[PDB]
Amino acid sequence: GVKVPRNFRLLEELEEGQKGVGDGTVSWGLEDDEDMTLTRWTGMIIGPPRTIYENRIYSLKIECGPKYPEAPPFVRFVTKINMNGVNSSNGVVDPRAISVLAKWQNSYSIKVVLQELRRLMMSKENMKLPQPPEGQCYS
């Protein structure tokens, strides 16, 4: 049931998410403020300037399982997006496509995942990809 190292870590991540973090351009918090298991999180990425994503906000669902942080979280975009490493029909982020997920370290975190996805949005492979209309979400 209650795994101390896991829960301690997720509470640290919760506290970190409640205050400004990194460069301020990604944020996270619990999807449901009553989920005492700390499993389901909402991620957010501010669409980067000078890319096709500019002036849009992106929502994500991040699930931190029983084995987190020893095992990487499951990550999917909610906001519809065309981006390498993400399934265009369901938003699931392919772990093999994302260095920090493919090569997960237990020192990584929800923050690191979101920061790396934001960095990837700015990369040459993604920054000009035509996008679905705004306000489309995967269910």
Beta strands in the chain (DSSP E): 26-30, 40-46, 57-63, 74-77
Resolution in A: 1.7
Residues 6+ apart with CB under 8 A from 52: 126, 127, 128, 129, 130, 131
Q: Are strands 57-63 and 40-46 parallel, antiparallel or unpaired?
A: antiparallel
What is the 8-class DSSP label of residue 17?
H
Element at 99 (helix H, strand E): helix 99-102
Elucidation technique: X-ray
> Mind listing the domains of the chain with CATH numbers?
1-139 (3.10.110.10)
Residues 6+ apart with CB under 8 A from 113: 43, 62, 72, 73, 75, 98, 100, 101
* Cα distance between residue 96 and residue 47, in whole Å: 23
Tokens of 63: 């699930």
What is the 8-class DSSP label of residue 79?
B
- Asked whether the CA dihedral 33, 13, 90, 129 is positive or negative, the reply is positive
Tokens of 19: 């205050």
Place of tokens 């492979």: 125
**In contact, 43 and 62? CB cutoff 8 Å:** yes
* Cα distance between residue 12 and residue 37, in whole Å: 14
Helix, strand or coil for residue 121?
helix
Letter string b/e over residues 46-67, b meaning 16 or more CB atoms within 10 A of that residue's CB: bbbeebbbeebebebbbebeee
* Cα distance between residue 52 and residue 58, in whole Å: 13
- Asked whether the CA dihedral 25, 31, 34, 35 is positive or negative, the reply is negative
